[PDB]
């Protein structure tokens, strides 16, 4: 009678990267903000989803791959994260462009439920 | 065993518009803040719900139509957005009046689940 | 194939009131913050849950009744709000004490689903 | 036709404690932020989940036990809180390390649903 959902959270991860499908955006890196939640039900004893690796992988994939659409980044990153942590039962990833519009915050996300 | 929910997000979209059912409010434009989430399961290849158009449409409809109740704006905007993006499975739209009361933030929303 | 949930929202409604079960707290009014969401499926034509009345009623009940526990306020206010707006399908009300502890924000809430 | 979920909330509880599995982190206390939601359906008359005790217990367990992984703290604290308040139907606890990385906020959580 007990359902336990563990999460690891990396929120407001901010760094600069080439990202975008419009030519003007790809001239120089721009500031983005990433939120990631990884959920699971059980790991091995003393095992953990290391937030250090997780943050470094997200930056590594974005900065090197220089994705076009945010949706392209979400597709690749989510598949990479699930392959690396097969135990996860749910993934939520949102990528926001902080400065692309002065009057709003825009972004795209993916929520994946694995059964 | 995999359910994927993609989202496009325009948050804290701030602009001035005529809005309101009380006569005093309609004399001059007032500052509002709009949050929109559009969710879907699949688009065509390299297709995307362009946050640029989405933001411009919301401003265009509010500024030109000069809605009375927030609920009138929500009714019209949601129907417009779904007609324009029939693929969406869920829409969340919230419109807030930033300055109408000095001691709170008031607003109205609509969450629509399409099956 | 369409489920529409309308909401009216009063967030971060801040005012001073007598509130508390500890004697020291009831000597003078203290600063609180109230969040209220009222959800419904349908109203009459051109009818609306007026956020003006809603905000004024919450302040009126808190300031006059000088509740003991936050839970006492939530019990009374929720019953009052549902009786006044029988059409609501869901109510969420959270009351927070802003200054009662310098190192956290504490509060209590009620979520009510009506069927 | 009425389902009522009461909550007690301690949010952004900030204090310093020894916490961490990396040797450098355990040399000195670091700033953390804790969010706790406790939900229930019914208590006795005039009974309440005292946010004062709750906040003090969380600080007491963290500062004295000097947990290794955040997940170790979550495991212990959640079991302690449920044992102390058997009436709870749902617990959400998130612990975040405020300064461990300058470019993000990292943390871990547990959501437990009791039936
Ligand atoms: N959804 C979406 N819309 C966009 N519009 C303009 C530029 N980039 C994008 C993008 O990356 N995603
Ligand atoms: N729900 C709601 N209440 C209101 N009250 C006053 C003014 N406008 C409004 C409005 O636009 N919506
Ligand atoms: N849950 C709860 N706990 C409290 N603890 C101390 C003071 N007041 C309260 C109160 O109003 N509610
Ligand atoms: N999930 C997780 N990852 C970590 N990585 C580094 C250091 N501590 C931790 C920790 O406490 N939890």
Author numbering:
A (entry chain A), B (entry chain A), C (entry chain A), D (entry chain A): 0 to 114
Give the published text:
Dihydroneopterin aldolase (DHNA) is essential for folate biosynthesis in microorganisms. DHNA catalyzes the conversion of 7,8-dihydroneopterin (DHNP) to 6-hydroxymethyl-7,8-dihydropterin (HP). Without a counterpart in mammals, DHNA is an attractive target for antimicrobial agents. Like other DHNAs, the active site of HpDHNA is formed by catalytic residues from two adjacent subunits in a tetramer.
We have determined the crystal structure of H. pylori DHNA (HpDHNA) in complex with a pterin molecule (HpDHNA:Pterin) at 1.49-Å resolution. The asymmetric unit of the HpDHNA:Pterin structure contains one GGG-DHNA polypeptide, one pterin molecule, one ethylene glycol molecule, and 134 water molecules. The M1-E114 sequence of the HpDHNA protein folds into a four-stranded antiparallel β-sheet (β1, β2, β3, and β4) flanked with three α-helices (α1, α3, and α4). Unlike other DHNAs, the α2 and 310 helices are not observed in HpDHNA apparently due to a six-residue sequence deletion. The HpDHNA:Pterin complex forms a donut-shaped tetramer with four identical subunits related by a four-fold axis. In the tetramer, β1 of each subunit reaches β4 of neighboring subunit with 11 hydrogen bonds, resulting in a sixteen-stranded antiparallel β-sheet in the shape of a perfect barrel wall. The pterin molecule is buried deep in the active site of HpDHNA. It is recognized by the enzyme via π-π stacking with residue Y50 and hydrogen bonding with residues D49, L48, E70, and I69. Although pterin recognition by HpDHNA exhibits common features of ligand binding by DHNAs, the exit of HpDHNA's active site is blocked by residues L21 and I51. The contact distance between L21 and I51 is only 5.2 ​Å.
